[PDB]
């Protein structure tokens, strides 16, 4: 979510340095933001208007993973072995 | 005044004619001002 | 430029005699600056730099 967090999650998922847009980087930028927002909703449980911005991040990650799994499972298995997913 | 409670359905009924009496004010008077 | 709760010589020009904020149909002011006006009023008003009601 931060400026320097979001620059560093780009930096170890890069794949050909100018890249910020591969489904590697986007799933990693989403997965970090989902995890950091889980602190918010233990403390702020009545906030439903911001859960919906989180469920959008869950669904935007699930579509990107189904994209990449159907396309290159070798990049899918490496990404899923990072990030602590599945 | 603020004598009675105005239930906010009938209080959200606004603009009597202000897009007529201030918008068509320079329209219906154009029979002479041309 | 960006009007501010400290600048009371600007804020007093849109405060009516009874203390009330004057609308945008009276003074010719843009809608961004009006809603920026009625925040700097309400900050100076809170901070006792301006009254809420006319009385004192």
């Amino acid at each position: 979510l931060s400026v320097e967090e979001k620059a560093q999650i780009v930096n170890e998922y890069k794949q050909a340095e100018g890249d910020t847009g591969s489904p590697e980087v986007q799933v990693a930028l989403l997965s970090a933001n989902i995890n950091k927002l889980q602190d918010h909703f233990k403390a702020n449980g009545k906030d439903h208007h911001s859960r919906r911005g989180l469920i959008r991040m869950v669904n935007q990650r699930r579509k990107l993973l189904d994209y990449l799994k159907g396309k290159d499972v070798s990049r899918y298995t490496a990404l899923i072995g990072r990030l602590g997913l599945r | 005044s603020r004598e009675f409670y105005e239930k906010p359905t009938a209080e959200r009924r606004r603009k009597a004619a202000a897009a007529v009496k201030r918008h068509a004010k320079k329209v219906q008077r154009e029979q002479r001002r041309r | 430029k960006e009007i501010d709760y400290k600048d009371l010589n600007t804020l007093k020009a849109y405060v009516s005699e009874t203390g009330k904020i004057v609308p945008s149909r009276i003074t010719g002011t843009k809608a961004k600056y009006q809603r920026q006006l009625a925040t700097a009023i309400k900050r100076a008003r809170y901070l006792a730099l301006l009254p809420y009601t006319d009385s004192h």
Partner: protein, 100 residues
């Protein structure tokens, strides 16, 4: 980060405000927090009563304190003080001057 604190003090206590402020500066510098502006206005007359007073002493300051430096600074009139009303007002940058 950047804040704009402006607080009143009760006018009978107007002689240790040079210490009040000073204490607030050293408490902000203890986390390296910069102080971009510090103005003491007059003993101005309020536009209404605050705790039945009619005159008060204004101090404005612009601060870049971290997070807990603000919280202890805000608690130096939240827990108790003889300072009244203040708005902390998060800003975005540093400044120059006011009071004509």
């Amino acid at each position: 980060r950047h804040y704009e604190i402006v607080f009143l003090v009760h006018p009978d206590q107007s002689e240790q405000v040079g210490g009040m402020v000073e204490r607030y500066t050293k408490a902000i510098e203890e986390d390296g927090g910069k102080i971009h502006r510090l103005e003491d206005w007059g003993r101005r007359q309020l536009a209404y009563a605050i705790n039945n007073v009619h005159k008060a002493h204004y101090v404005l300051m612009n601060v870049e304190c971290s997070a807990k430096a603000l919280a202890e600074l805000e608690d130096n009139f939240r827990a108790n003080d003889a300072v009244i009303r203040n708005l902390v007002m998060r800003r975005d940058e540093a400044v120059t001057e006011q009071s004509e």
